[PDB]
Design a protein around this ligand. Structure first.
Ligand SMILES: O=C(O)[C@@](O)(COP(=O)(O)O)[C@H](O)[C@H](O)COP(=O)(O)O
Ligand SMILES: O=C(O)[C@@](O)(COP(=O)(O)O)[C@H](O)[C@H](O)COP(=O)(O)O
Ligand SMILES: O=C(O)[C@@](O)(COP(=O)(O)O)[C@H](O)[C@H](O)COP(=O)(O)O
Ligand SMILES: [Mg+2]
Ligand SMILES: [Mg+2]
Ligand SMILES: [Mg+2]
Lengths: 448, 91, 450, 448
């Protein structure tokens, strides 16, 4: 035992290390404090997210640090690759992953900025997680909807509507062609609209629209609440009322409560929509934070049936290439590494069910060719303002959006170039659909 | 606009989506004034500083603690041996 | 520390204090013992309802009495205004409010009579209460009834009917046009009519009436009982049978058990009717007690869907101007002070749901013009004797009262002065409704003062 | 069936009726509206508290009103006696008694003022009530205290003390000679003193004083709360901490919740102190309300172990003769009617256990001779201000009060007249008790 402070790289930088198939790997983009070499910064991140601290400790001799320490094994420019032994992690706990990988290392004086770009989850650790309870294929069977993207939309105004008026908007949307509707992420239980009231009114509107159209419908009832117990109570009630879906803000509620709700959702027969409120607080900036592709891996592991992924073309930020990679991570059994899409590692999903991507935010009929081109059939397209903002209201707006999606789907199956011929496809459909003609006219000038 | 007693609801509105808009390149929430009428729907700490000092019977100084190291890798038995030495020594 | 007895006035009278928006305020009408000045009596009430006792105590120095004491901050004649800091009260407990405000101060030798006239509940404290489970607007959607007062009535005789005969009366009333019917406040479970039998027979009567009229119907099944556990058991059974409503005597059962029943009603999806039995024991006399407007505020805070407010014109006492104020306290988002109605403070309701006023007691068809003029549309009018006492029985009586209310409402919406033209509006309807004509003939000479 | 309004007197006034042993009887003092004969006003009370309403109903023919109606069978000046058949009441429910007897009859225009003076509870109905769970004799055995009144006191200031300072006052009081101490009626759980903290701090003080004095001690922890469930939760916690007592405001909490708390108390082995907060809102005025002796009967039926009865000589109102009757009602097996004490009926108690009277409110050492003379040994005397207001604090004050009571009990047992020689008895004890001397000097001029 030699007391005193030693540089982190002496023990935690090992560019000769060859990662094992059981290791958990991380890709960190590091911005060191000026004067701190890149190797010392990367080693500090590895040390203080595994086994080390700022000075040597006599208790190091009571353990086999060679077995348990993480190691930065490769540095490519400002990107550091770090490997973590399988034994460092608690089985089935995303919370534990976060507490090591992003626990303290983002606040060190020696590392000015730090962003976790990707993470390789090893198969041996994935087997301790359940994944989604329903999955794309079973959900299409439960809805009896095949061969196209599914239609949805957030009820607006976000807040302020009574339960009665809120449910009237739901009825109008579903009656007009939307497959689903949803509560806004911030609509929980408030003085103007208490959750029990909303749940009762809405399911009556869902049943009515379902009877009148002859198509199956659902509404994503938000159970997000201040405690795990209250969320479970709201899920139990939605199931009692015969709802197909519930909704949870998995990041604001948090991963521990999220896991509790996901377990209860499967026991009640509910499908689980996951809203990513708060994600942009730490996945927006390229120099610091956690990229959403990491959050999307954690989401699939705990087990959401959908998660929002961005629209690329809408009102919220999202890169086309990164979004395409995120969609594969959510839907495929195996995703090869792809630098062109920001995927730093191959990801085997070990038989876990796939998650529905969900595109929402500032989109309207003119975006439908782009969206089909980006996502294909296996996705939800959500039209909030794009439905209720129609000159003739939600019902007319729902019809315009549903017809647009089916026109572009039919064109693709016929082999046409849906981007090169996008407007032509929408104009042919508008000739037999007055509601689509009016939507194209109102928003023809709205671009982001 | 807010659900009584729910921090989760506050976050869902205030930091829900507004950090990812194309029109706003960066955004930082600096402070927040919680009104008294809303605070009263929250319980606050279960113990509190004064009751805790009574339970510890320690007054008139900062209190001493420390994180067991190495972070990970110690057996349960060796972990508790480190604990004992620290507490026996004055922490 | 200086031991010994000091006048309450020295510490608990502060005419310079400016109430805070978080303070709870009371208006007391005080009748001091002769020889005791008003200021000393008012300070005694403030002292012994907050922090003080009859002599100085060394332990006053272990706390900041400046922060917690109540203060009488204004006196006008025999009215005393007292302010209580927000931190003196337990969140969400009417029981605690009463324990301080009306706990011991009504029994002091130095204060010969005491009446609490009004109370200002601050917004910061209201937010700790849930309010009504359903509320007027949700309830109208659950019933599918709009644009008129709702019709009800107590089943008579109060006691003695078998469960089977009890339900037969219910059926006749609902079949004849009443929207609801109710158990008498004193009908709980008795040898001549046990609660399980009554609930079963009655719900069968309600379903038959709904099917024959094509209108939604309800009955207010009284779950009042000797213990909280028994009341909850009876509520569970009412929900199992599909009842839309339950009923509780919130004062005789008490506020603690009332809170328990209100919570379970929301969980069960039941609407909660509240009967104010016992209120007159302490809200009647002008010199001593608690004015009903305070009880109504507490009622809305705990959360009842309806509460009886009186009729003004019926067999039970009630003042018109005071009732108008009470009706606003139950239904409106904000009620400004109004000395003419006895509203001593502005009352903000902080988004709590509203409560249905219920007018009941010794009323009949001739009172309908006055009832509509007083309450408007958002109210229940209950006719017990006024229904079963009809010459041809309950079904005919229910038809007569229903038609009367719909005619007075129509005439009002047509712009007529229903008070100046009340008799004419009723006589016009009678020409097309034999039941109403005969009800008007029977009770035309039955009047109560006002 | 003859429709129309009839005078209440025709059916509900019967001066030839003989009350049965199974009838519940009431004595009402009635102030009719000017112009309403006394017989009509009494008939109206009988009718609208049993079976009648304001007009004849066809459904009367479906019922045997002769079997079930109440009847005014006697009028003596402005006092009306009314008999109610046993079958009108629900077994074991004070709530049902109130809903009939005092439900609506106090608010009729025809009766300008109404006061219920006394009530004869028949033995056949009493057998459906459990009565106190402990009782005076069992309680004295649990405390191991005999041959004197018991000492208590409310902690002061009423509100504002932290839990720590609160338990310090408790410790001084018990260490000084008080048998018990109690929370104020309005101390429940508040931001300055939460109930969990208070229960923990106080029980530590109780055990500490118990060990230093060698006598058994107790504190009346207030479980009064806004809902039945919360009160039961607090009672469970008191029992878990090994408390001998809990306390409930049985009127502000309400009788239904009171019954719930009484049942749980017996199951938990707790003795139940009952505070009568709010009683003066309806029992103070002689023209309108309910006399406390009625509430005292209902209290013993549900089963409180103590209840406050007033001091007569203190700061709160109370008539001596009426107080002597109320104590007999609470303690004796059978109480015969007595016009000099306001007892309108004989009351058989059917074997129910007796209740401890509790005298409290503005009393000090000079009142002890009167209190012993009034109540005898089986009572609590509570000194709040009379303890903490001592020139030298709570321990000194508790000593002065304990010494005074034992000096007076000692003089009585020797055959001295404790009232004629009260001053001499206290002065003799003060010669050897400086704490008593200082209390006598401090409060010698304080009289009510
Ligand atoms: O709150 C909103 O703005 C939305 O309801 C969109 O409403 P419109 O349909 O009216 O735009 C969605 O929650 C966002 O799209 C979420 O963003 P993301 O999908 O990127 O998490
Ligand atoms: O018991 C009764 O007398 C009633 O059923 C009325 O019967 P009628 O309809 O036959 O008069 C009601 O409970 C009273 O109106 C309550 O008084 P309030 O509404 O003033 O609390
Ligand atoms: O709050 C109070 O005033 C007391 O704590 C007395 O304190 P002191 O001992 O300082 O007077 C008691 O609650 C009253 O005696 C109750 O009145 P009753 O016994 O008549 O119900
Ligand atoms: Mg949204
Ligand atoms: Mg009634
Ligand atoms: Mg007290």
């Amino acid at each position: 035992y030699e007391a005193g402070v030693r540089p982190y790289r002496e023990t935690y930088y090992d560019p000769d290390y060859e990662p094992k198939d059981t290791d958990l790997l991380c890709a960190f983009r590091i911005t060191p404090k000026p004067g701190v070499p890149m190797e010392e910064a990367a080693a500090a991140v590895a040390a203080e997210s595994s086994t080390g601290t700022w000075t040597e400790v006599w208790s190091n001799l009571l353990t086999d640090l060679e077995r348990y320490k993480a190691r930065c094994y490769r540095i490519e420019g400002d990107v550091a690759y770090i490997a973590y032994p399988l034994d460092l992690f608690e089985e089935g706990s995303i919370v534990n992953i976060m507490s090591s990988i992003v626990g303290n290392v983002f606040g060190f004086k020696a590392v000015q900025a730090l962003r976790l770009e990707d993470m390789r989850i090893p198969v041996a650790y994935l087997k301790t997680f359940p994944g989604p309870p329903t999955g794309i294929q079973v959900e299409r069977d439960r809805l009896n909807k095949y061969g196209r993207p599914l239609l949805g939309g957030t009820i607006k105004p976000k807040l302020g509507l009574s339960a009665k008026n809120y449910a009237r908007v739901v009825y109008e949307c579903l009656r007009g062609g939307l497959d689903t509707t949803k509560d806004d992420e911030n609509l929980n239980s408030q003085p103007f609209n208490r959750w029990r009231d909303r749940f009762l009114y809405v399911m009556e509107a869902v049943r009515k629209a379902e009877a009148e159209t002859g198509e199956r419908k659902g509404h994503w009832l938000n159970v997000t609440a201040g405690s795990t117990e209250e969320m479970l109570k709201r899920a139990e009630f939605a199931a009692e009322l015969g709802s197909r879906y519930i909704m949870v803000d998995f990041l604001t509620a948090g991963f521990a409560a999220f896991a509790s709700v996901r377990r209860r959702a499967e026991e009640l027969g509910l499908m689980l929509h996951c809203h990513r409120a708060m994600h942009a607080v730490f996945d927006r900036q390229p120099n610091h934070g956690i990229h959403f592709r990491v959050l999307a891996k954690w989401l699939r592991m705990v087990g959401g049936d959908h998660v929002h992924t961005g629209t690329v073309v809408g009102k919220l930020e999202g890169d086309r290439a990164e979004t395409l990679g995120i969609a594969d991570l959510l839907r495929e059994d195996y995703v090869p590494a792809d630098p062109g899409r920001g995927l730093f590692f191959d990801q085997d999903w070990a038989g876990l069910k796939p998650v529905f991507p969900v595109a929402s935010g500032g989109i309207h009929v003119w975006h439908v060719p782009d969206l089909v081109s980006i996502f294909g059939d296996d996705a939800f397209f959500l039209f909030g303002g794009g439905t209720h903002g129609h000159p003739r209201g939600s019902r007319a707006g729902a019809t315009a959006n549903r017809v647009a999606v089916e026109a572009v789907v039919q064109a693709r199956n016929e082999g046409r170039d849906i981007l090169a011929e996008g407007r032509e496809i929408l104009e042919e459909a508008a000739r037999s659909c007055p509601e689509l003609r009016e939507a194209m006219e109102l928003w023809g000038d709205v671009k982001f």
